[PDB]
Amino acid sequence: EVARAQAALAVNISAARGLQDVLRTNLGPKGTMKMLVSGAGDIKLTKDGNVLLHEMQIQHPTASLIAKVATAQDDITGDGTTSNVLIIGELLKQADLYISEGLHPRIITEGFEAAKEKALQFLEEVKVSREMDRETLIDVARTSLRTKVHAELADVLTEAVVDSILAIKKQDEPIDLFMIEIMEMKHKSETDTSLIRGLVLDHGARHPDMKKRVEDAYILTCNVSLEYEKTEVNSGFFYKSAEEREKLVKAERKFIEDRVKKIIELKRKVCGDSDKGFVVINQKGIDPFSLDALSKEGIVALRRAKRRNMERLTLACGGVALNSFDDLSPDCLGHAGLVYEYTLGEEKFTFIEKCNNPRSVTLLIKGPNKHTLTQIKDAVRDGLRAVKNAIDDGCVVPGAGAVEVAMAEALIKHKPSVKGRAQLGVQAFADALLIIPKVLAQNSGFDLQETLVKIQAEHSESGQLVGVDLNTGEPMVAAEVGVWDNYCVKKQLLHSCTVIATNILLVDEIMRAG
Amino acid sequence: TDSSQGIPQLVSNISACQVIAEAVRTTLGPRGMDKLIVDGRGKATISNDGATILKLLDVVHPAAKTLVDIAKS
Amino acid sequence: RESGRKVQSGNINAAKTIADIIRTCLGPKSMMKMLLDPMGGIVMTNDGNAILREIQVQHPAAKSMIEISRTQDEEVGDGTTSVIILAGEMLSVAEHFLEQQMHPTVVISAYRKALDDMISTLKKISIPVDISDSDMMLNIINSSITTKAISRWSSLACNIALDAVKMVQFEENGRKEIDIKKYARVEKIPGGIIEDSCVLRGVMINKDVTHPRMRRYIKNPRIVLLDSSLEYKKGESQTDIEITREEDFTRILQMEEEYIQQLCEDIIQLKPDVVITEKGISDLAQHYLMRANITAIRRVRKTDNNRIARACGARIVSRPEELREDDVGTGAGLLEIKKIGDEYFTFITDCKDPKACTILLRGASKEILSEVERNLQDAMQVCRNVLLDPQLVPGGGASEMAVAHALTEKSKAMTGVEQWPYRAVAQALEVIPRTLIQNCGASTIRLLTSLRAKHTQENCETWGVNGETGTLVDMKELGIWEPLAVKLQTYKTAVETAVLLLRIDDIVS
Amino acid sequence: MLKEGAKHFSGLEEAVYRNIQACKELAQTTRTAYGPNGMNKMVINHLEKLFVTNDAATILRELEVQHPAAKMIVMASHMQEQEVGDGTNFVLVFAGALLELAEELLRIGLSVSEVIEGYEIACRKAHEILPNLVCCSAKNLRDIDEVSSLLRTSIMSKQYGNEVFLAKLIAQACVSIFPDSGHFNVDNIRVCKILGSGISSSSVLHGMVFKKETEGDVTSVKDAKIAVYSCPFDGMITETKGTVLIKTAEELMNFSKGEENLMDAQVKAIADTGANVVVTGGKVADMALHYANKYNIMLVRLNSKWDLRRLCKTVGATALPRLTPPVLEEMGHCDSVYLSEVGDTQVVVFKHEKEDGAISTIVLRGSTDNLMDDIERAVDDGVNTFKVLTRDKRLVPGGGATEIELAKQITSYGETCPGLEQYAIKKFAEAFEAIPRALAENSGVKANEVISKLYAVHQEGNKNVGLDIEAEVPAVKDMLEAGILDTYLGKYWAIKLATNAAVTVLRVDQ
């Protein structure tokens, strides 16, 4: 079955707004956190333009495309997915009106080009070089955190954000792939967003608190067997001859007590003291008797700290992965000035920290470990991706819709070409730009035009980058405020809009494909 | 996982409790009508009182079950 | 089962509904079609290629239109749009009126002379391109990559695809036709530089041949391509019974390995350190290679050795007796096992039956490689067509209107019955100037008549509407080239096709 | 929204509507509860005990709803019960009544980005001055009426009449045997259900009290190695009767042979496992019984998980099946083990007394569990409220007598601040009356009558209603100077937690 011309075109602009209608309630500090018990079937909560999409199982074809383009954006950004989605259908509104007044989608898109340029050129024209500083980074942090969460909890997330960004700069990485580590913690309150200068280890041991407090670490992160197995296997499984099984079982325990007594040789060689800890960390489990033999000597033997640990341990601690205990030096291991096996909630979380050459500085988030703690787990990560860009770019323009009254109004003042063939796409383009500044402004109970005319003229008058106060929907000055748009963030959402806004505009017919 | 709130359930509780009393209305001095009661088990069921047929009758009501148990208490 | 108009109007219900969005999907301003997958999915297509596949059959004649879109895809891979456009664009006007004039027939011979006046119009407007100069082709060859448009490798892959079909052109049938492509083949290369995506001789084997032991390179020693029975034969050339006895066992193994021997008596004389065994490859057979100081090559097939037959230029041995050099690994040979990325690439250069040459395409990744791989296509296809037909013709309304009034003039020249199909076929030309403007957004009407006027003055010789500029202009100016190859090939198809479904007045079972 | 597709249970209308609606309608229980009430809820989780309850936690345990908030929000309400036992029948109605206050402002069009803030802001302003309206504190926890006073809001809140002896009994329980230094234990001090006697006869027998029968002897020594076994005695190989008379006179013996000499080695190795008490999750065979007495091992004929759990908990036990000679990984915890007659029932009594790990155990005597559970429910939520681990409870005016106190605090502070939050804060000055109404409802008057006369008392701190004639016309029961008092702990929580629930539940559109 087919839908001709405007029909398939009507389906385009139709689905687009409910997206944004989420965003008008999802955008910025003005936006609202969205609990989804339906979307995946999971019990969820989210603020973001990208994340709410994918969380849903979305049956509408137009919206099958929609979760795609903000994805690559949210990767870089973390914000503007809450925004780019707005401009697209706001553009689809205009583009519809112009074919509603009649036009082809081609002679529509033709005017996007110079309009996209002059605005993308206006990106250059405006772009505010902000010396990238924890203070300024706090602002770019919290603006995305405020975008997604309480300004309160934004600043709660902001620290650990701005904590590990200078610490990933410490790793000479302008982006952030490490010290991105966001550690959920079992707690009565998600209120705690903390920083660990080193990892948060998983299992101290199944025999717990061996050496719980290690203030000088010699870290052996070892995928070895202190649990090889204690149970009944012949070739490693159940063979057809039952009497032949337990014959190899002792040697399985003995090959553990091979490695165990090696530690008694190793902890001796390494330490000779419980003062500076030799730390067994096993990617597998560890026998409690291995633990017992080790724990009583002042050894902490960790099991099943994951391969991410096995790296970050080998990494953050200056550590090693050495798959045979045998005999090794303390310097054959890495070092961390604190390894502490810590219980808040059920699991004991061993904190290996003060890690020398930290390759991972863990961001601790305590809490119920609900979607709530996830709700502060995504914004930080999203805010991390924002300050990641803020580390990436040396130029961050204001947020709060301060850009478009500088950007759109200029394109509203002039067709970039100053000829009508552009106007067909310039009216559409320049219009759609103003949704974000107007929406939350009007979402606050403040009419857009009266709100825009100020922030427009307040840019026209003062030459000012002039923000919106997202909760009070009033013209503000976002240059000083700290709601600030990464040049990395804002650029792609323009492309992300344009790239997805043309073909769907250029597709006038849909049909069942099988 | 079912409930009825307010007076509607409250008043609904009494008749289920009352109807069985409308049987025993005078079953101590016995005279009245006594119907031989054959349950779904083929069991002809009678009483010298109200309690034994009350023993025989069951309800999903907590209410109608209470005074049953209470009269049984 | 259909009959009469129900076929004929149903034929109109076949290709036109196919060709409806396709004209928006066609032209350099091509507007994709939205599709709705049976999963609930979407596919955005300017293609006449993808639509017919996914979209379910709307009429039996469409199933015939699908294949002439295939036939043009088979012939080129572009023009699949226009063939179902042009033929279906012929179906709407002429037939029913001319069945009211009572004939499928007069329309056919009209279509045939509706064919020739274009073929008559072309030779002027279709004018020889120089296959010698790359840029004289590359202007056509940029015209091939410009609409589909992966722009970065629409630059290099052309000169590559130029050189591709050029380096794969020896082609000798005695008539020197150039359809010759297959020798030119992409190469799927992990890692490596985004450049050095380029044409090399023979076939460097990226398919099934990747080994830790080929050594790491076998240059002068041969690559040996066995169709033949590297596994033992228990008799002379043949096989005998198995072992039920002490007597039979010793008798069997002699001629078994002796066959492998008498093979690799005649196989070893030609100096492989790599024998690629596509058939006859087996443990003891390749274990013998392992023991023969000749690489045991398994997980390898006919395409491989047919590509190696296309690489060094070998002939995969069909004789169990007497293998030689020119059998397998022709010339001194080069078998170059290179890991660009982690795949061992069997590079077999030094092609005999030369001018059979693959294309080494190296991105930093498969996409940026596939970006070379896709841009290569239209280029090398049109290159093939330009090397086939060393002519070019102005695109757009140029060929459309120059033939349009021609057929119209021819219709007036005839002033007969078949004029009416010429009247119908001339307009079939002009839906493209529509199509080109039906993209850009102006009123084709003003331009149609103006393109009529472009014919009124210039006969629309080189002057078409150029879809992306949406105006009526010289294409020798713009260097926009349909070849007499690409177009007449596309036009030839639809000319037959409209006849075909018009040759159908009855659909039955 | 504009799509055939995607998903939601909430949003648009629904967020403004359904997310506020049923979350309130949940309050009907807490609307009739929290403070003295005769009103109760028969909740049948079908146990063949048809459970009277006003306790929101085990009311909401069954309740399941598609409203994502009401789906969620029970969390914060149950997260409350974790933190305080009382105040939970307060949680659901307060915010629930405080919810549609915002929804009326939503009808006025006062934003979700706006209204809940003022609540949150006055949630501060409450918890700002909420510790200022603290008056008393529960200090000596060995003392009865410092403990039973906190109890005298809490059990009272759950249920009215029974409260007084309970509060005594719970303070006479001395949950202070746990020094409450940061120490409290729900299993060590435990409820032990005894069918019959009185609920006034319901007592606290320190130790571990098992209404299950001590079988045969008592422990060899009072520091037992306690054998807690799921199936130590199932029988080894059982006897039979074939002909509806006897099977065979010959076949009788060999099975007792397997029974005895196994249960010989069984209970001999229940003696060789060093068990002074063998605690049988399953039954006992009279042979092992005989063996349990000869080998001198206190025998418990049957054990519910109620035993076995606390056994695993307290003793360090693992309840085990045994057809074999055992070994004790259970050992004991206990310094004392007994058969005592409690409930005047022969009872398995495991015992010791310490500060820490000390078992000092409530023994409830009641004709049913619906007696001994909902009352226990009423009971333990005071026992739970006893759990603060700030020894001084910072007792505020009990019975919700701080409502009128904060009410004029918040409404005066709602006057101070400008902007739409001044309403929300003044709306926050409103939902106070819910429990005063919830009282006045089960008491039978409107909170207006109550609260307006308690708007006449202005700053009072003492007078607030309940279930009583004093709570109807006089609008007054003295809930600060009472004997009925409540901690600041649950005050810190419920006002904030029910808000924490109400925070984003209007925000959630999807």
Curated annotation (Swiss-Prot), chain A:
Keywords, alphabetical: Acetylation, ATP-binding, Chaperone, Cytoplasm, Hydrolase, Isopeptide bond, Nucleotide-binding, Phosphoprotein, Ubl conjugation
One GO MF term: ATP hydrolysis activity
UniProt modified residues of type N6-acetyllysine: K188, K276, K354, K366, K377
Chaperone in keyword set: yes
Cross-link (Glycyl lysine isopeptide (Lys-Gly) (interchain with G-Cter in SUMO2)), chain numbering: K240
Domain of life: Eukaryota
EC number: 3.6.1.-
Subcellular location as annotated: Cytoplasm
Binding, Mg(2+): D79
Signal peptide: none
UniProt binding sites for ADP: G28, G80, T81, T82, S83, T147, K148, A400, D485
Reaction equations catalysed: ATP + H2O = ADP + phosphate + H(+)
Biological process per Gene Ontology, one example term: chaperone-mediated protein folding
Modified residues (Phosphoserine): S194
Chief localization: cytoplasm
Binding, ATP: G28, G80, T81, T82, A400, G401, D485, K490
An example Gene Ontology CC term for this record: extracellular exosome
PROSITE patterns per UniProt: TCP1_1, TCP1_2, TCP1_3
Annotated disease: De novo genetic variants in nearly every subunit of the TRiC complex, including CCT6A, have been found in individuals with a broad spectrum of brain malformations, and clinical phenotypes ranging from mild to severe epilepsy, developmental delay, intellectual disability, ataxia, and other features of cerebral malfunction.
Subunit and interaction comment: Component of the chaperonin-containing T-complex (TRiC), a hexadecamer composed of two identical back-to-back stacked rings enclosing a protein folding chamber. Each ring is made up of eight different subunits: TCP1/CCT1, CCT2, CCT3, CCT4, CCT5, CCT6A/CCT6, CCT7, CCT8. Interacts with PACRG.
PANTHER family membership: CHAPERONIN (PTHR11353)
Record-stated family: Belongs to the TCP-1 chaperonin family.
Name of this protein: T-complex protein 1 subunit zeta
Organism from which the protein derives: Homo sapiens (Human)
Lineage, broadest ranks: Eukaryota, Metazoa, Chordata, Craniata, Vertebrata
Designated gene of the protein: CCT6A
UniProtKB/Swiss-Prot annotation, chain B:
Domain of life: Eukaryota
Subcellular localization(s) per the UniProt record: Cytoplasm
Binding site for ADP: G29
Chain sites annotated for binding ATP: G29
Residues bearing the modification N6-acetyllysine: K55
Reported disease: De novo genetic variants in nearly every subunit of the TRiC complex, including CCT7, have been found in individuals with a broad spectrum of brain malformations, and clinical phenotypes ranging from mild to severe epilepsy, developmental delay, intellectual disability, ataxia, and other features of cerebral malfunction.
Assembly description: Component of the chaperonin-containing T-complex (TRiC), a hexadecamer composed of two identical back-to-back stacked rings enclosing a protein folding chamber. Each ring is made up of eight different subunits: TCP1/CCT1, CCT2, CCT3, CCT4, CCT5, CCT6A/CCT6, CCT7, CCT8. Interacts with PACRG. Interacts with DLEC1.
Annotated function: Component of the chaperonin-containing T-complex (TRiC), a molecular chaperone complex that assists the folding of actin, tubulin and other proteins upon ATP hydrolysis. The TRiC complex mediates the folding of WRAP53/TCAB1, thereby regulating telomere maintenance.
UniProt family annotation: Belongs to the TCP-1 chaperonin family.
Name under which the protein is recorded: T-complex protein 1 subunit eta
Naturally occurring in which organism (per UniProt): Homo sapiens
Taxonomy of the source species: Eukaryota, Metazoa, Chordata, Craniata, Vertebrata
Residue numbers of the full-length protein present here: 13 to 85 of 543
Curated annotation (Swiss-Prot), chain C:
Keyword annotations from UniProtKB, A to Z: Acetylation, ATP-binding, Chaperone, Cytoplasm, Disease variant, Disulfide bond, Hydrolase, Intellectual disability, Isopeptide bond, Nucleotide-binding, Phosphoprotein, Ubl conjugation
Annotated positions of the Phosphoserine modification: S155, S228, S229, S237
Leading EC class: hydrolase
Subcellular location: Cytoplasm
Residues with PTM N6-acetyllysine: K207
Record EC number: 3.6.1.-
GO function term, MF aspect, one: ATP binding
Record carries keyword Ubl conjugation: yes
UniProt key word ATP-binding: yes
Reactions performed catalytically: ATP + H2O = ADP + phosphate + H(+)
Disulfide bonding pattern of the chain: C351-C357
Taxonomic superkingdom: Eukaryota
Positions that bind ADP: G27, G79, T80, T81, S82, T147, K148, G396, G467, E468, E482, K487
Residues that, per the record, bind ATP: G27, G79, T80, T81, G396, G467, E482
Chief place where the protein resides: cytoplasm
Functional summary from the UniProt entry: Component of the chaperonin-containing T-complex (TRiC), a molecular chaperone complex that assists the folding of actin, tubulin and other proteins upon ATP hydrolysis. The TRiC complex mediates the folding of WRAP53/TCAB1, thereby regulating telomere maintenance. As part of the TRiC complex may play a role in the assembly of BBSome, a complex involved in ciliogenesis regulating transports vesicles to the cilia.
Similarity annotation: Belongs to the TCP-1 chaperonin family.
Subunit annotation: Component of the chaperonin-containing T-complex (TRiC), a hexadecamer composed of two identical back-to-back stacked rings enclosing a protein folding chamber. Each ring is made up of eight different subunits: TCP1/CCT1, CCT2, CCT3, CCT4, CCT5, CCT6A/CCT6, CCT7, CCT8. Interacts with PACRG. Interacts with DNAAF4. Interacts with DLEC1.
Name of protein: T-complex protein 1 subunit gamma
From Swiss-Prot, chain D:
Keywords for this protein: Acetylation, ATP-binding, Cell projection, Chaperone, Cilium, Cytoplasm, Cytoskeleton, Hydrolase, Isopeptide bond, Nucleotide-binding, Phosphoprotein, Ubl conjugation
Entry keyword ATP-binding: yes
Position of the Glycyl lysine isopeptide (Lys-Gly) (interchain with G-Cter in SUMO1) cross-link: K446
A GO cellular component entry from the record: centrosome
Binding site for Mg(2+): D86
Binding positions for ATP per the UniProt entry: G87, T88, N89, S157, K158, G399, D486, K491
List of residues that carry Phosphotyrosine: Y17, Y492
Reactions mediated catalytically: ATP + H2O = ADP + phosphate + H(+)
EC number: 3.6.1.-
Disease: De novo genetic variants in nearly every subunit of the TRiC complex, including CCT8, have been found in individuals with a broad spectrum of brain malformations, and clinical phenotypes ranging from mild to severe epilepsy, developmental delay, intellectual disability, ataxia, and other features of cerebral malfunction.
Family the entry assigns: Belongs to the TCP-1 chaperonin family.
Subunit structure: Component of the chaperonin-containing T-complex (TRiC), a hexadecamer composed of two identical back-to-back stacked rings enclosing a protein folding chamber. Each ring is made up of eight different subunits: TCP1/CCT1, CCT2, CCT3, CCT4, CCT5, CCT6A/CCT6, CCT7, CCT8. Interacts with PACRG. Interacts with DNAAF4. Interacts with synaptic plasticity regulator PANTS.
Protein name as catalogued: T-complex protein 1 subunit theta
Source organism: Homo sapiens (Human)
Lineage: Eukaryota, Metazoa, Chordata, Craniata, Vertebrata
